[PDB]
Amino acid sequence: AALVVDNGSGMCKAGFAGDDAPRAVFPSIVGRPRHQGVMVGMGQKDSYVGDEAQSKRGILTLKYPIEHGIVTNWDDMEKIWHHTFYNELRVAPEEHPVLLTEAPLNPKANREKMTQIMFETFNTPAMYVAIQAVLSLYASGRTTGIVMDSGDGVTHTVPIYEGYALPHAILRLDLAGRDLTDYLMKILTERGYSFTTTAEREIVRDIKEKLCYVALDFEQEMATAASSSSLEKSYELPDGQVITIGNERFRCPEALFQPSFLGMESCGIHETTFNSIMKCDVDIRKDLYANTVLSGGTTMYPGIADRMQKEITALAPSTMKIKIIAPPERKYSVWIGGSILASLSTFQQMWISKQEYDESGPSIVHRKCF
C-alpha cells in the first residue's frame, strides 16, 4: 500500500511497505555530459540518473543533489524521485502513500520544500517525514537506546528511552562518508595516485568500501605499517591498472575518531555519542550505554564496533557495562524501520492528507514530525 523512500545523500533506497529489503537501490547522482559543439550519434539522454550515470561515468559530471543531508539543487532531486517512482519501482505516486526520511537538526525550509514537491508536482495522496535514527532504532526492535547513525551525508546521534526521544540531547556532526572519501582521495595523491575528476570520486569511494578498516589502536597500527608490508593490499581498478597502498587503509576512517586530520575542529564519533548520552537525564544513562545502536554505511568498516567499545569505555566510568548493537543489516537500517512503521496499523492515523495540506500549507509537517 505505502511506499518507503529513504532519500540518502549517497545511495537513494526505496521500495514497498512491509518488506524485508528495498527493491530500488542506486546512487543519487545526476550526470550531465560534456557540452561541446560536436554532435552525438543516434540520440541520448540529456541528463542521466542513478545506475545509468554510474555505468557511463567517464564522461558525465557527477553532481550529488543532497550535500550533508541538505538538498542543494531541487531540479536534480526532482529527477531522482521521478527515476525512483516510474523507472525503478514501476508504480505511480498518486495511488501509494510516501514515507520519507531526513536527518535531525536539518533546515526547516527543506521539509516544507520536500513536502511541496510531493503534493504539488507528484500529487501524492499522503506523506510523512521521519527521523533516520528513530527508524534505525525501530528496525533493530528496541524502544530504548541511542542510535549513532552515520551515512555519507551526515553523522548524528539521537538518544531515546522507552519510546521517548530526547530532542535537546541530539548532536548532528559534519563528518561523514563523503568527507572520508575526499580524505582518502587526498592521501592517495600524496603517494602518487592522483584522482581529480568526479569519475574517479566513485573509484576511490569503491576503494574505501573494500580495503579500509577501523584501527583498534592507531599508534600501534602506524608502527606495524612501517615495519611490515603484509597489511599493504592491492586493488585493481575498472581499468587494468592495479595500485598498492599501505598506510591509507586504517588512516582514512581514523578521521571519524580524529576530526583534526580533515580540519573540522569537531568532536569524534566516539566522544560525540558520549557527549549526547551525558546531555540526557542522569537516571536513563545505563540503558543508553547498553543500547549503543549503529546504522548506515559509515558504520560498515570492519572493527568499528570494537573501537567504539574501547573509546566509550575509556570516556565513561569504570563501573558501566558498555555494549554496541551492530547488526549485519545496519547499512539498510533506516529503510527497514520505515517499512515496519508503514506496516503498523497505528501509522494509518498519523499521515498527512491532501485536504489538510490545502487548509494549512507546508508548515503542517513540523507539527506531524516531532
Ligand X SMILES: Nc1ncnc2c1ncn2[C@@H]1O[C@H](COP(=O)(O)OP(=O)(O)OP(=O)(O)O)[C@@H](O)[C@H]1O
Number of residues that bind another protein (CB under 8 A): 37
Closer to another protein by Cβ: residue 45 or 286: 45
Closer to another protein by Cβ: residue 36 or 346: 36
Judge contact between 28 and 9, C-beta under 8 A: yes
Give the x/- contact pattern for ligand X in 312-331, rule: CB under 6 A: -------------------x
In the chain, what's the furthest Cα-to-Cα distance?
71
Q: At closest approach, how far in Å is the CB of 240 from another protein?
A: 5
Using CA atoms, how far apart are residues 199 and 202, in angstroms rounded to an integer?
6
Strand bridging mode 11-16 / 24-27: antiparallel
Using CA atoms, how far apart are residues 43 and 226, in angstroms rounded to an integer?
54
Q: Taking CB under 8 A as the rule, does residue 237 contact another protein?
A: yes
Give the x/- contact pattern for another protein in 24-53, rule: CB under 8 A: ---------xxxxxxxxxxxx---------
Closer to ligand X by Cβ: residue 258 or 360: 258
Element (H, E) at 137: helix 132-140
Judge contact between 78 and 121, C-beta under 8 A: yes
Locate the DSSP E strands across the chain: 3-6, 11-16, 24-27, 98-102, 126-131, 146-150, 155-158, 171-173, 233-236, 242-245, 292-295, 324-325, 352-353
Closer to ligand X by Cβ: residue 8 or 268: 8
Give me the residues paired with residue 5 across strands.
Answer: 14, 100
Q: Taking CB under 6 A as the rule, does residue 205 contact ligand X?
A: yes
Q: Using the rule CB under 6 A, which residue among 2, 3, 5, 10 binds ligand X?
A: 10
Q: Taking CB under 8 A as the rule, does residue 210 contact another protein?
A: no
Using CA atoms, how far apart are residues 49 and 55, in angstroms rounded to an integer?
10
Give the x/- contact pattern for another protein in 167-206, rule: CB under 8 A: -------------------x--xxxx-x-xxxxx--x---
Q: Which of residues 45-64 bind ligand X (CB under 6 A)?
A: none
Give the burial string for 99-113 (b: 16+ CB within 10 Å, else e): bbbbbbebeeebbbe
Q: Which does 115 bind (CB under 5 to 8 A by kind): another protein, ligand X, none?
A: none
Q: Taking CB under 6 A as the rule, does residue 153 contact ligand X?
A: yes
Q: Taking CB under 8 A as the rule, does residue 319 contact another protein?
A: no
Residues that bind another protein (CB under 8 A): 33-44, 56-59, 61, 186, 189-192, 194, 196-200, 203, 237-242, 262-263
Residues that bind ligand X (CB under 6 A): 6, 8-11, 132, 151-153, 177, 181, 205, 208-209, 296-298, 300-301, 331, 334
